[PDB]
Design an enzyme around this catalytic site. Structure first.
Site, PDB file in Angstrom:
ATOM      1  N   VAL J  58      -0.261  -6.192   1.892  1.00 51.33           N
ATOM      2  CA  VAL J  58       0.490  -5.544   0.785  1.00 51.33           C
ATOM      3  C   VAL J  58       0.162  -3.967   1.294  1.00 51.33           C
ATOM      4  O   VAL J  58       0.853  -2.800   0.838  1.00 51.33           O
ATOM      5  CB  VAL J  58      -0.710  -5.515  -0.555  1.00 51.33           C
ATOM      6  CG1 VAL J  58      -0.201  -5.235  -1.588  1.00 51.33           C
ATOM      7  CG2 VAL J  58      -1.074  -6.899  -0.728  1.00 51.33           C
ATOM      8  N   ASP J  59      -0.832  -3.854   2.158  1.00 50.89           N
ATOM      9  CA  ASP J  59      -0.930  -2.241   2.442  1.00 50.89           C
ATOM     10  C   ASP J  59       0.355  -1.700   3.333  1.00 50.89           C
ATOM     11  O   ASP J  59      -0.050  -1.151   4.409  1.00 50.89           O
ATOM     12  CB  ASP J  59      -2.540  -1.807   2.608  1.00 50.89           C
ATOM     13  CG  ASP J  59      -3.250  -2.069   1.411  1.00 50.89           C
ATOM     14  OD1 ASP J  59      -2.603  -1.370   0.390  1.00 50.89           O
ATOM     15  OD2 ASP J  59      -4.616  -1.871   1.493  1.00 50.89           O
ATOM     16  N   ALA J  60       0.820  -2.668   4.093  1.00 52.97           N
ATOM     17  CA  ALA J  60       1.784  -2.564   5.092  1.00 52.97           C
ATOM     18  C   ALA J  60       2.946  -1.119   4.393  1.00 52.97           C
ATOM     19  O   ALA J  60       2.458  -0.194   5.239  1.00 52.97           O
ATOM     20  CB  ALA J  60       2.855  -3.814   5.614  1.00 52.97           C
TER      21      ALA J  60
END
Lengths: 101, 77, 266, 52, 77, 77, 77, 52, 77, 77
Positions: J58-60
């Site tokens: 998600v935080d890529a």
């Protein structure tokens, strides 16, 4: 097609292979088709209507019960009456008074 | 000259926002009504009456918006 | 008469401020920039309402009997029962302060809000013409100060309860540790707890002020803009709404004060 | 603008609001009447029952 | 001077947002009301009262915004 | 020109966003309230009291924007 | 002058965004709380406590954002 | 709108009202209804004890 | 004139976006936590402790956004 | 040199959008994680590993956006 059972605690009401049925579910009228996903619901009093193999029409009245669905099997656990009034609590009183008298 | 030109954008934003709001609200209400009619086909005349009762409240403000947008586009121009 | 609706609205949003130092009546046309000029209109109506409340409650308490209740006593017994039931619902402690405080808050806030239902120009016209006061607005609740003073008093009460019943040790412990309980978060915990703590009474006071202010300004706009023959069709649907608004807002203030005090104490 | 007309219209609107409040917000005293009936009846009947 | 044009745009934005919110929130509320009335068709007069009770709370700020937009459009501009 | 109209646009932004947030949040809350009341038609006073708590909590912060916008409009501009 | 005048618009944007976020989040949270209290009416004081616990977490960032907007519009402006 | 020293005078009025109400107002009230409930309950209790 | 003003504008938009994101994420997380608490009230001490850990991850990024916004407002000026 | 001021706004928009996206995505993921932990409390350490695996994805984009905005803000400006 699926194999429909209609049974009660006292008797087997109907058994046979069925192409489709119409049944009144707890929250609304429901239709069941072969390969239907597993389903569990009570059924309100009224008619359940059936087409057997070759689409022969059959109508059965039920006071109530529980309908459930399984892969290839549909089973209706009907009961004798609504039972929701619970008038028999009055029937239990006389059993006590006659024991006291 | 900007007094004439800018008024069309001020009406365009009003008539876009009013349309988006009315469309989303009526879509949600109509979806709920359709699901209720599907579950309970006997109650359709009653659910339709209640749906028309409620829908006149959704349109109250977006119709003011669209009327004022028409006014801004045409009268003052 | 000759007037611009903008100035009509302007006058109504002004207050009979009076200088505490020089004892001089401020005027709406030119506001000075001195801090100590009490806004008299809201405060004058505000304590009058408290006096009426105290007078009525004493006039019923001085005679009430456990026999056949009168028609007049019944409303006061009902309001006492409602406040007592709300307190008993949301407070279990022994503090005798909570229930009369909530009762006073509810009744006084209800009385202050009720002033908004009155015709906007009646009392101001009377004060300007008969008396001669430069300005007047009669709903006390629309004053930010009345709201903020009450909210800050409630916050002071919350701090007192946290220090005394909850404990100063139990206050530093909660501020430092909670909600994350780890020393890495303790600086963050202090900030979050302080922000929420100050948010609560500010929320109470500014909620009440926003409601009363945004009802009073709606009444003023309706009066100033529309022709007389057409005012009723938009004024009447608004006062019916504002009756429920004022009831709900007084109930909200009372219940939220109760909730905050109970959470501080227990 | 004329200020007299505003006072006329505000009076009209307040009259209409007072009428609406009296005929739709006042009746809750009827709900309050049930409390009086209950209190009087229950107190008198229960005291009589206890003494009897 | 050109200043008058921006007041229309500000009133347009304020009223459009007010109509978006007043439509969408009322739509959600009415959809839930209809869903609940489908289940228990005998409880419509009570659900309808509570729906009005909450709906009054819903649109208040949109009503403020719409009134201020009308003021800005007509009285100020 | 730059003085008054930018203040009006700022107030419009404040009181459009506040209306959006308050309307949507109160609609969301009222949907769950009305859903609960259909499941347990007897418990309505308790659920509506809890709804009043949450409604006050929701309404508290948009009213900050509403009042500040009114201030910006009239006191400042 | 424009320099301070635009600060009002900046504070307007900041606090409007803060208000919409806080209002929507608190509305969702309160809706879940109401549904939970409708499933288990005897449990309401516990769920209400939990709701206050999480609401103190939700509002912190909107509260500080609104406070900083007030700072920019009063101390700075 | 504009903050003013009205914030202080109302802070005096509020505390004065709170003190006076806390002392005099509340304690006399709520006694009568509690007396009614206690009379009904103790009459019931006494009558049922004599019934036993 | 407009350098510091635009600095404040950038800080305003930054902090508004951060507040929106934090409020929405914590609202969703708290709503699901409330539902899980409602299902099994006796498990609340564990679910609350896990919710705190997850909410820390939620809060991680809006706090650096808000810190940089405060830096822009106060230090850079 | 006006070049500097626009870069702060360009960093601010990037970081605000990254914060919104990451906070809403992580809240959505964590809500289902918490509901699943509510249903099967014994499986929590496995669901935590799965949640971490998913959260790492998600935080890529959000962490790249935050890094690039921080780079623009300090090194470039």
């Amino acid at each position: 097609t699926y194999h429909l059972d209609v049974v009660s605690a006292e008797q087997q009401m109907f058994s046979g292979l069925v192409e489709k049925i119409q049944v009144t579910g707890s929250e609304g009228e429901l239709g069941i088709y072969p390969g239907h996903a597993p389903l569990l619901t009570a059924i309100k009093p009224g008619m359940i209507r059936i087409v057997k193999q070759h689409g022969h029409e059959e109508f059965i009245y039920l006071s109530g019960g529980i309908l459930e669905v399984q892969p290839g099997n549909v089973t209706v656990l009907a009961d004798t009456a609504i039972r929701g009034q619970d008038l028999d609590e009055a029937r239990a009183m006389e059993a006590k008074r006659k024991a006291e008298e | 000259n900007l007094n004439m030109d800018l008024l069309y954008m001020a009406a365009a934003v009003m008539m876009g926002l009013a349309a988006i709001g009315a469309a989303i609200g009526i879509g949600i209400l109509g979806g709920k009504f359709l699901e209720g009619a599907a579950r309970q086909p006997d109650l359709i005349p009653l659910l339709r009456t209640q749906f028309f009762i409620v829908m006149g409240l959704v349109d109250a403000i977006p119709m003011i918006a669209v009327g004022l947008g028409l006014y801004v586009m045409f009268a003052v121009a | 008469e000759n007037m611009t609706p903008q100035d009509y609205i302007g006058h109504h949003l002004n207050n009979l401020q009076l200088d505490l130092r020089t004892f001089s009546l401020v005027d709406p046309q030119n506001p000075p920039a001195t801090f100590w000029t009490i806004n008299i209109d809201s405060m004058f109506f505000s304590v009058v309402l408290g006096l009426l409340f105290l007078v009525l409650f004493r006039s019923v308490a001085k005679k009430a009997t456990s026999g056949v209740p009168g028609k007049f006593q019944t409303a006061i017994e009902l309001v006492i029962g409602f406040v007592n039931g709300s307190v008993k619902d949301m407070y279990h402690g022994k503090s005798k302060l909570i229930a009369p405080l909530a009762l006073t808050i509810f009744v006084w806030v209800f009385l202050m809000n009720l002033m908004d239902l009155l015709p906007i120009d009646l009392l101001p016209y009377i004060a300007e013409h008969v008396l001669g006061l430069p300005a007047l607005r009669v709903v006390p609740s629309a004053d930010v100060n009345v709201t903020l003073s009450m909210a800050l008093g409630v916050f002071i009460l919350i701090l007192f309860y946290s220090i005394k019943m909850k404990g100063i040790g139990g206050f530093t412990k909660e501020l430092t540790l909670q909600p994350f309980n780890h020393w890495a978060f303790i600086p963050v915990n202090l900030i979050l707890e302080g922000v929420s703590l100050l948010s609560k009474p500010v929320s109470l006071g500014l909620r009440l002020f926003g409601n009363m202010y945004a009802g009073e300004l709606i009444f003023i706009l309706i009066a100033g803009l529309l022709p007389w023959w057409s005012q009723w069709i938009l004024n009447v649907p608004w006062a019916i709404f504002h009756i429920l608004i004022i009831t709900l807002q007084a109930f909200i203030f009372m219940v939220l004060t109760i909730v905050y005090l109970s959470m501080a104490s227990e | 603008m004329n200020l007299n007309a505003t006072i006329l219209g505000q009076a009209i609107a307040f009259v209409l609001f007072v009428l609406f409040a009296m005929k739709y917000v006042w009746p809750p005293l009827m709900a309050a009447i049930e409390k009086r009936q209950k209190e009087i009846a229950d107190g008198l009947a229960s005291a009589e029952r206890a003494h009897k």
